[PDB]
Amino acid sequence: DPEIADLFYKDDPEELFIGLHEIGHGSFGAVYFATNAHTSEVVAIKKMSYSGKQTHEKWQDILKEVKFLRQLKHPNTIEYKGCYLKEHTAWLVMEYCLGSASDLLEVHKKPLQEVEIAAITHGALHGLAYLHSHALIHRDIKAGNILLTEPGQVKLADFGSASMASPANSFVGTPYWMAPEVILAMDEGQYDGKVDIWSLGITCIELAERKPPLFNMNAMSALYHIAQNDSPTLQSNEWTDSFRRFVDYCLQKIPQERPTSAELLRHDFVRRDRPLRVLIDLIQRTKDAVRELDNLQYRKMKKILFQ
Numbered sequence: 061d062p063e064i065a066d067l068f069y070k071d072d073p074e075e076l077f078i079g080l081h082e083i084g085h086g087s088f089g090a091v092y093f094a095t096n097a098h099t100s101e102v103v104a105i106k107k108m109s110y111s112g113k114q115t116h117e118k119w120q121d122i123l124k125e126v127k128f129l130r131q132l133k134h135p136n137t138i139e140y141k142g143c144y145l146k147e148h149t150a151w152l153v154m155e156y157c158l159g160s161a162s163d164l165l166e167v168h169k170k171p172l173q174e175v176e177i178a179a180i181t182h183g184a185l186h187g188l189a190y191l192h193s194h195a196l197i198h199r200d201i202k203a204g205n206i207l208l209t210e211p212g213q214v215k216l217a218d219f220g221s222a223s224m225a226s227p228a229n230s231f232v233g234t235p236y237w238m239a240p241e242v243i244l245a246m247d248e249g250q251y252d253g254k255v256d257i258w259s260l261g262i263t264c265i266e267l268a269e270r271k272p273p274l275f276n277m278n279a280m281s282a283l284y285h286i287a288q289n290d291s292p293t294l295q296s297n298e299w300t301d302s303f304r305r306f307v308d309y310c311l312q313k314i315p316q317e318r319p320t321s322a323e324l325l326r327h328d329f330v331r332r333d334r335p336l337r338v339l340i341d342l343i344q345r346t347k348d349a350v351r352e353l354d355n356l357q358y359r360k361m362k363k364i365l366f367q
């Protein structure tokens with residue numbers, strides 16, 4: 061019906077975008093760097109197929125992601141440009157980013173610097189405070205869904221699990237980064253935006269340690285351990301106390317004891333002065349490191365030099 065047709069532009073995207081290069085993938089298909097042939101603008105295109113046996117679920121997921129992106133306007137959420145449709149493939153068009161925070165980890169094969177973590181966290185928190193103020197929940201916060209534009213701005217992306225309401229109940233997320241109350245809700249009970257704060261805490265650990273906790277287990281074992289056991293913490297004592305206190309505050313298992321996004325914006329870790337150029341310099345040092353990679357690793361990370 062019109063409710064669904066109204067989500068999509070009516071012209072054929074195949075002509076409109078040129079010079080496609082893959083920059084990501086997921087179950088749906090790939091993401092591409094592309095240029096509008098008429099305006100020269102560079103964009104990202106997430107192509108999401110709903111062919112085949114999983115057509116119904118795939119189409120519902122497209123619809124949910126498009127409807128969610130349509131409502132957003134904030135400097136730390138990815139800019140949405142609209143969506144095209146061709147041959148059982150939706151072309152979701154976004155502003156183009158250099159890469160994810162997970163990509164920055166992969167290029168360096170080391171944790172990020174603490175001030176880089178803070179900067180990224182700070183931007184992510186603004187996005188989360190916006191979302192939560194609108195009764196929204198991201199539900200899949202992780203380093204691979206926090207992007208950086210080439211100029212150094214932090215963008216939340218991947219709204220494929222997101223909630224249009226709060227409280228919510230669905231058992232959704234990426235298991236290692238899921239809040240205990242999502243797991244304990246078992247698709248029936250309730251949780252709210254603070255699940256993103258738990259996930260942010262896990263993301264902090266990820267950026268500090270290269271991987272989330274429990275990553276040597278299967279999903280089934282991790283979900284049990286997240287529910288049953290004491291929350292994780294930063295392993296190293298090298299980190300400042302402020303960063304360690306930040307993480308611990310995020311990783312309060314009881315939601316009533318965990319800060320909101322608005323509250324965590326006032327925490328010392330993100331309020332502490334840091335250098336003006338932290339994100340610009342992280343970007344530059346990343347490009348410089350991609351230029352030194354061997355061809356095995358470069359083949360995977362060449363997108364970082366696409367501009």
Ligand SMILES: Nc1ncnc2c1ncn2[C@@H]1O[C@H](COP(=O)(O)OP(=O)(O)O)[C@@H](O)[C@H]1O
Binds near residue numbers: 087138158163218
């Ligand atoms: N707007 C974008 N600009 C640059 N890269 C992007 C953009 N959107 C996605 N990507 C890349 O594609 C990857 C997968 O996209 P994502 O939307 O997270 O898909 P999935 O839902 O299936 O995880 C990201 O982790 C990122 O590396």
Ligand SMILES: [Mg+2]
Binds near residue numbers: 086
């Ligand atoms: Mg993703």
